[PDB]
C-alpha cells in the first residue's frame, strides 16, 4: 500500500508515487564541512519561541508531531538566510534502531542518533498548505541529537509517548516550551531543499545547527518503543524513520560561521 520505511515501501520506492524524489533540490544531504562556504552576509538567526502555544502530540504512523497554534505570530523564526517571518507549526524527530544511525542529514558522513525538525511556514503565503507549494515556503530548523547526558527539556515529550503508542493516537500537550530543545550555539549550515518525507515538495530552506543536543540512552529508548502500526495491528517498532542523504547536485551549502 502506501509509503513508509520498510523493505517494500521505503525510500528507494518513493519515486514511483513521488517522481520529485529524484529532483534537483532533495533532502536530506551530507554536509561536507570542508566544502561549505562561510557566508559573512548571513545574519544571526532569530528564534522567538517565548510565546509558543503547543496544543497536541500525535502519532501519524511515520513519527510523532508536537503541534503548535500557528494562527498568530506567537513562535517565529526569522533572520539567518530567511526573508520574512516563518511561524512554528510543528516539530518531530527521525531516529534510529541503534545509536549509530537515525539522523537524516549527516556531517562529513557522520550519522547522529536522531535529528529534530522544527517546521516553520512563511506567513506571506497565509497557510501551511499554500506555503509548501512555494520555493521559499518552509524553513525547517534541523538539530542533531547524540546519546550522552539527558536533555531535561525533552522529558515531558518522552513521558507522554506511552499514551500515543500507535498510529492515529493523539494527546493534549499544552504548555510545552520548545526553547528547552535548543543547543547553546545557533551556528548553522543552510541550503535549499525539500520535505524529507512524501510528498517531498521542494519548498524548504534548511537551517541545520552545527551544535548537537545530547539526550540520554533511556530517552531515545522511549522513542523506539513507539509503533508504526495502529492499535490492534501486529507491532512494528517505530525505528529508522529517516531518509538517507540525497545527491547535492547543483547546490552550495553555506555556513554562518568559520
Ligand atoms: N521531515 S521534514 O522535512 O521536516 C517535514 C516532514 C513533514 C512535513 C513537513 C516537513 Cl518540513
Ligand atoms: Zn523531519
SS (H, E, C) the chain: CCCCCCCCCCHHHHHHHCHHHHCCCCCCCEECCCCCEECCCCCCEEEECCCCCEEEEEECCCCEEEEECCCCCCCEEEECCCCCCEEEEEEEEEECCCCCCCCCCEECCECCCEEEEEEEEEHHHCCHHHHCCCCCCEEEEEEEEEECCCCHHHHHHHHHHHHHCCCCCEEECCCCCHHHHCCCCCCEEEEEECCCCCCCCCCEEEEEECCCEEECHHHHHHHCCCECCCCCCCCCECCCCCCCCCCCCCCCCEECCC
**Domain coordinates in residue numbering, the chain:** 1-258
196 marked among binding-site residues: yes
Residue 236: Cβ-neighbour burial (10 angstroms; 0-12, 13-18, 19+): middle
CA 198 to ligand 1 centroid distance, Å: 9
Phi/psi of residue 77, nearest 5 degrees:
-110, 135
Nearest residue by C-alpha to atom 9 in ligand 1? 195
- The CA 71 to ligand 2 mean position distance, Å, reads 22
Does residue 62 carry a catalytic annotation? yes
Using most ligand atoms within 8 A of CB, pick from 140, 193, 208 the residue to mutate for ligand 1: 140
If you compute the radius of gyration of the chain from its CA atoms, what whole number of angstroms results?
A: 17
- Decide: residue 38, CB within 10 A, 0-12 exposed, 13-18 middle, 19+ buried: exposed
Resolution in Å, one decimal, please.
2.1
What CA–CA distances, in Å, run from 160 to 173, 177, 226? 8, 15, 11
Does 119 sit in the ligand 1 pocket, CB within 6 Å? yes
Contact 201, 195 (CB under 8 A): yes
In a 13 Å sphere around the CA of 143, the CA atoms on its Cβ side amount to: 24
Cα(39) to ligand 2 centroid in Å equals: 26
How many CB atoms sit inside 10 A of residue 45's CB? 20
CA distance 174 to 155: 14
Locus of grid cell 539567518 = 80
CA separation for the pair 181, 116 (Å, rounded): 9
| Structure-solving method | X-ray
The response to whether 94 counts as a known ligand-binding position is yes
Give the homologous superfamily in CATH for domain 1-258: Alpha carbonic anhydrase (3.10.200.10)
Residues with beta carbon < 5 A to ion ligand 2?
Answer: 117
Residue nearest to atom 2 of ligand 1 (CA): 195
| Shortest-distance atom of ligand 1 to CA 27 | 3
Amino acid at each position: 500500500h502506501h509509503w513508509g520505511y520498510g523493505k517494500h515501501n521505503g525510500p528507494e520506492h518513493w519515486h514511483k508515487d513521488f517522481p520529485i524524489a529524484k529532483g534537483e533540490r532533495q533532502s536530506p544531504v551530507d554536509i561536507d564541512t570542508h566544502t561549505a562556504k562561510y557566508d559573512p552576509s548571513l545574519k544571526p538567526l532569530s528564534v522567538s519561541y517565548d510565546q509558543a502555544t503547543s496544543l497536541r502530540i500525535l502519532n501519524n504512523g511515520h513519527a510523532f508531531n508536537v503541534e503548535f497554534d500557528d494562527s498568530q505570530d506567537k513562535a517565529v523564526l526569522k533572520g539567518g538566510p530567511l526573508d520574512g517571518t516563518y511561524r512554528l507549526i510543528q516539530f518531530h524527530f527521525h531516529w534510529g534502531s541503534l545509536d549509530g544511525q537515525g539522523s537524516e542529514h549527516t556531517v562529513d558522513k557522520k550519522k547522529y542518533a536522531a535529528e529534530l525538525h522544527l517546521v516553520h511556514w512563511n506567513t506571506k503565503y497565509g497557510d501551511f498548505g499554500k506555503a509548501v507549494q512555494q520555493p521559499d515556503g518552509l524553513a525547517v530548523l534541523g538539530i542533531f541529537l547524540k546519546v550522552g547526558s539527558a536533555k531535561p527539556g525533552l522529558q515531558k515529550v518522552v513521558d507522554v509517548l506511552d499514551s500515543i503508542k500507535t498510529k492515529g493516537k493523539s494527546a493534549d500537550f499544552t504548555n510545552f516550551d520548545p526553547r528547552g530543545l535548543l543547543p547553546e550555539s545557533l551556528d548553522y549550515w543552510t541550503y535549499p531543499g525539500s520535505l524529507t518525507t512524501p510528498p517531498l515538495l521542494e519548498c524548504v530552506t534548511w537551517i541545520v545547527l552545527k551544535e548537537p543536543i545530547s539526550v540520554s540512552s533511556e530517552q531515545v529508548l522511549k522513542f523506539r518503543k513507539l509503533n508504526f502500526n495502529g492499535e490492534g495491528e501486529p507491532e512494528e517498532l517505530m525505528v529508522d524513520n529517516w531518509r538517507p542523504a540525497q545527491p547535492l547536485k547543483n547546490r552550495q551549502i553555506k555556513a554562518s560561521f568559520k
